[PDB]
Every structure is written in C-alpha cells, then in structure tokens.
Structure 1
Amino acid sequence: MKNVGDLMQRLQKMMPAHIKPAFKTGEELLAWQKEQGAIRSAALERENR
C-alpha cells in the first residue's frame, strides 16, 4: 500500500526537518541504552535510601 522510503517521507510531514537521528545503526544504539540505564540506576538508588 505504501513502501519504506514513501512511508518515511509520509511520517516526515509530522515533523520539522533537520532532526536527524545521528545513530545510523544498532550496536551504537544499544551502547547508548546501556549508558542511560546505568545513569538512571544511580538516582533510583538515591530515592530508595
């Protein structure tokens, strides 16, 4: 019904441009997730104590 590039351009109407992900791939994203999770764990521990 609608394919990838057209799907992406379709969703792009909802946003402004110059919004790029700057992620480009997967393992980098997982690294970023690891970092954010370990950030959060600390404040979580604070609130517990």
Structure 2
Amino acid sequence: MKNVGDLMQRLQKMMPAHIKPAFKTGEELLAWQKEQGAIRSAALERENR
C-alpha cells in the first residue's frame, strides 16, 4: 500500500525540513540511549536522595 518514500513524504508533511534524525543506524541508537540512561539515572538518584 505504501513504502518508505511515500510514508516519509507524508511524514515531512507533518514536520518541516532539516529534522535530520542523528541516528541513521542500529548501534548508535542503543549507544546514545545508554548514554541518556546513565545521565537520567544520575539526576534520578539525585532526586531520590
């Protein structure tokens, strides 16, 4: 029914240009996620304490 092209085009119809994802891949995703995980845990334990 629809492919990457048409779907992402309809997606840009929602949200404008220069929205580049800064992941592009499967490993940097999990890496930055773990980074933010530890950074969040820092202020989390801070808020607990």
Normalised TM-score (structure 1): 0.86
Structure 1 unmatched runs, 5+:
none
> How much has 1:7 moved relative to structure 2?
0.9
Match of 1:7 in 2: 7
RMSD between superposed Cα atoms in Å: 1.0
**Partner SS, residue 11 of structure 1:** helix
Deviates more, 1:2-11 or 1:33-42: 2-11
Moved over 3 A (4+): none
> How far, CA to CA, are the matches of 2:40 and 2:14 in structure 1?
30
**Partner SS, residue 13 of structure 1:** helix
Give me the identity figure in percent.
100
Structure 2 unmatched runs, 5+:
none
**Partner SS, residue 16 of structure 2:** coil
> How much has 1:22 moved relative to structure 2?
2.2
Aligned residues: 49
> How far, CA to CA, are the matches of 1:45 and 1:22 in structure 2?
28
